[PDB]
Structure 1
Amino acid sequence: CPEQDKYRTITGMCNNRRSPTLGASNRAFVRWLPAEYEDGFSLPYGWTPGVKRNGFPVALARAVSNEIVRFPTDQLTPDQERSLMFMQWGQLLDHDLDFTPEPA
């Protein structure tokens, strides 16, 4: 951790001198609330058949998408106050902040 620097590191290491890894790449996310897993620490809700969540059966993500999200693409309402650039800048910006890897 150098005493004086003019530029950012590529990895973000050393931006916070007190906690050098804060903001750096390939490190766990911070948590604003504790995790809620089916077994308390790893299994996700909807993993075990029959296991309710907070007293109610877990809805299938695709069923929620089907009954709440699905709409006729003929009926699309265009945002009269924003351009498609507003959308694209969001995805570009999202790709500066976070990427959650999975295995292969």
Structure 2
Amino acid sequence: CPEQDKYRTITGMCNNRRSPTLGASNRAFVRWLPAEYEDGFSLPYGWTPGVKRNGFPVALARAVSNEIVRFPTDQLTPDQERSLMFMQWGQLLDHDLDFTPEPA
């Protein structure tokens, strides 16, 4: 790890002169609370059936999206205190912090 960076790295290799890898690109996520899988190490909670999360049957996501998410597009509500550029910086932000891959 170098001496007197006048400028940044790119991949972020060395912001942490101590744990160089830290904050870096293509290293894995951090977990502020253990991971909760259905086997305990690698199977989606809603994976096998009759498998209960914690005494309750894992609810389908299409169905939650339907029962609490659904709405009559006609009854929208303009946020009169903020403009879209607000919802569009959210992305410009997400888009700078995280991204997790899938495999083609």
Identity %, equivalent residues? 100
Cα separation, 2, equivalents of 1:41 and 1:29: 15
SS where residue 49 of structure 1 aligns? coil
The TM-score with structure 1 as length reference comes to 0.98
Shift of 1:85: 0.4
Shift of 1:4: 1.3
Could you list the runs of 5+ residues in structure 2 that have no partner in the other structure? none
Could you list the runs of 5+ residues in structure 1 that have no partner in the other structure? none
Cα displacement string for residues 56-86 of structure 1 (whole angstroms, at most 9, x for unaligned residues)? 0000011000000110010001101000100
SS where residue 50 of structure 2 aligns? coil
Cα displacement string for residues 9-55 of structure 1 (whole angstroms, at most 9, x for unaligned residues)? 11010010000011000011111000000000000101001111100
SS where residue 66 of structure 1 aligns? helix
Cα separation, 2, equivalents of 1:5 and 1:89: 29
Shift of 1:3: 1.4
Runs ≥4 residues deviating over 3 A: none
Aligned length: 104
